[PDB]
């Protein structure tokens, strides 16, 4: 239930993970600043080795679609 425990499985498709992430966070009780920061922080930090590598590589300015396409696979 905690957004903090939303973690991507080794074989779990990225888009599956981001889906679980987005839906936990929307129902999460927090301010808007925090949610941005959780999005900017946890999403990358909780991803699997490879998707973490690919995301950190794109940068904080990366867009969700950029992230989707790169991790598609």
């Amino acid at each position: 239930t905690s957004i903090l425990d939303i973690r991507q499985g080794p074989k779990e498709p990225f888009r599956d993970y981001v889906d679980r992430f987005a839906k936990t966070l929307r129902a999460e009780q927090a301010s808007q600043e925090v949610k941005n920061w959780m999005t900017e922080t946890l999403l990358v930090q909780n991803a699997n080795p490879d998707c973490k590598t690919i995301l950190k590589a794109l940068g904080p300015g990366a867009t969700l679609e950029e992230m989707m396409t790169a991790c598609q696979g």
Partner: peptide, 12 residues
């Protein structure tokens, strides 16, 4: 991305 990026894609 930002929280706003997740709301546009997955919704509120």
């Amino acid at each position: 991305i930002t929280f706003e990026d997740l709301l546009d894609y997955y919704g509120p």
